[PDB]
Amino acid sequence: SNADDLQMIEMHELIQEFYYYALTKTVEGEQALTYLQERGFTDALIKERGIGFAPDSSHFCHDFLQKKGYDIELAYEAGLLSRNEENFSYYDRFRNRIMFPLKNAQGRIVGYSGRTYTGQEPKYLNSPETPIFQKRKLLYNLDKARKSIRKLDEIVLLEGFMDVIKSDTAGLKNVVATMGTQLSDEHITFIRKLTSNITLMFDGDFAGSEATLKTGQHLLQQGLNVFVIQLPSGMDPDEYIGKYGNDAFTTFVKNDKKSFAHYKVSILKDEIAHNDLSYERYLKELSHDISLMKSSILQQKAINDVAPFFNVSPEQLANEI
Ligand SMILES: O=c1ccn([C@@H]2O[C@H](COP(=O)(O)OP(=O)(O)OP(=O)(O)O)[C@@H](O)[C@H]2O)c(=O)[nH]1
Ligand SMILES: [Mn+2]
Ligand SMILES: [Mn+2]
Ligand SMILES: [Mn+2]
């Protein structure tokens, strides 16, 4: 029910204050605080994002919510507590982790991502699916980024919320990220209400490239204008910012922004040039991709940009389309 949903949100927003205190003030949170500071987190940024620390006692959140008069089973359903199936006892889901609040589209805290700082697995532990937290719907930073997304008529999608935090601080405000999942149909429905222009800047690795191709292809099919920013090999936005700085990052992002079709063929360049079977198949694919582009202007430029990769004229490529 809506009443129960509000209770769950309250739990999250109240424990946030305790997590924040634990991180910034307490002895147990000292190492976690140092970790964040070494990753460039100022006191102001930590406070702004409401970042905290979950102690390792396994009953920190439990006792707090119990003291505040919340139903323990509801706290379990809210994904803040886990349940020992043997004795039906409850304990903290998040233990010895740095706690990043996950806010919904209305800016209410509906879940957490807890990062290890001692090299434990998994690196990030998220809230489970709950009535208020759904990974297929939530886009990190969306409530904060909405204004700039509308103003700039563009949304930029990153892989990690950490990248979003750093990108925002660097000056790139129209950024969001899924919680480690493939962009859903629901996400795309939400996004297209804000803008038709979506730029993908995933990590500069094989998985990032594969995700870019897959996500970009689906966005293109849905009638969105897709662009790609390709980071240097082995880097994500956070790593690029840490190595080159904020100004270099915002310049880089503004520099090479390619339409999806151009990025795609550039990735397939070597295979096309050596494999005649792949040549034919990718010429057909790229022809189909370009045909899907709603922008007549960018459709024409894509034709001019893609044609050289197949050693054909723009007129020849246009004919195939
Ligand atoms: O164990 C994991 C790892 C990743 N993820 C989800 O996948 C996204 C991309 O995972 P990454 O591992 O690329 O995140 P990152 O590099 O920004 O993390 P740091 O090492 O810099 O701290 C993350 O933002 C997270 O949402 C998890 O949920 N659990
Ligand atoms: Mn990756
Ligand atoms: Mn990354
Ligand atoms: Mn990273």
**Domain finish residue from 75, 105, 134:** 134
Kindly report the three-state secondary structure assignment for every residue of 11-70: HHHHHHHHHHHHHHHCCCCHHHHHHHHHCCCCHHHHHHHCCEEECCCCCHHHHHHHHCCC
Q: Which residue's alpha carbon is at the smallest distance from atom 19 of ligand 1? A: 162
- Most ligand 1 atoms within 8 A of CB, residue of 116, 118, 124 to mutate: 124
CATH code for position 2: 3.90.980.10
List residues in the chain that are followed by a break over 2.5 Å (C to N): none
Q: Could you tell me if 254 and 266 lie in one domain?
A: no
Which residues sit in the known binding site for Mg(2+)? 159, 203, 205
Phi, psi of 303 (to 5 degrees): -60, -45
Q: Which residues lie below 8 Å from residue 164, measured CB to CB, with a gap of 6+?
A: 140, 141, 158, 175, 176, 177
- Pairing of β 89-92 and β 155-158: unpaired
Cβ-Cβ contacts under 8 Å for 284 (sequence gap 6 or more):
320
Ligand 1 pocket by Cβ (under 6 Å):
113, 115, 122-124, 126, 159-163, 179-180, 203, 236, 238
**Of the residues 239, 259, 279, which one is the last residue of a structural domain?**
259
**Burial class for 14, CB neighbours closer than 10 Å (0-12, 13-18, 19+):** middle
Q: How was this structure determined?
A: X-ray
> What resolution in angstrom units was achieved for this structure?
2.0
Last residue of one domain, picked from the residues 103, 134, 165 = 134
Asked whether the beta carbons of 102 and 127 are under 8 A apart, the reply is yes
DSSP string, 73-127: HHHHHTTSEEEETTTTEEEES--SEEEEEEE-TTS-EEEEEEE-SSS-SSSEEEP
Q: Are residues 250 and 264 both part of a single domain? A: no
One domain for residues 121 and 149: no
- Distance (Å) from CA 314 to ligand 2 centroid: 36
Contact 107, 50 (CB under 8 A): no
Structure token digits, residue 272: 């096309």
Place of tokens 């009638």: 223
CATH code, 305: 1.20.50.20
Q: Are residues 181 and 293 in the same domain?
A: no
What domain range includes position 81?
1-134
If asked whether residues 10 and 114 sit together in one domain, one would say: yes
Number of domains in the chain: 3
Look at the block and give the residue holding tokens 């601080």: 169
How many Å apart are CA 314 and CA 98, to the nearest integer? 53
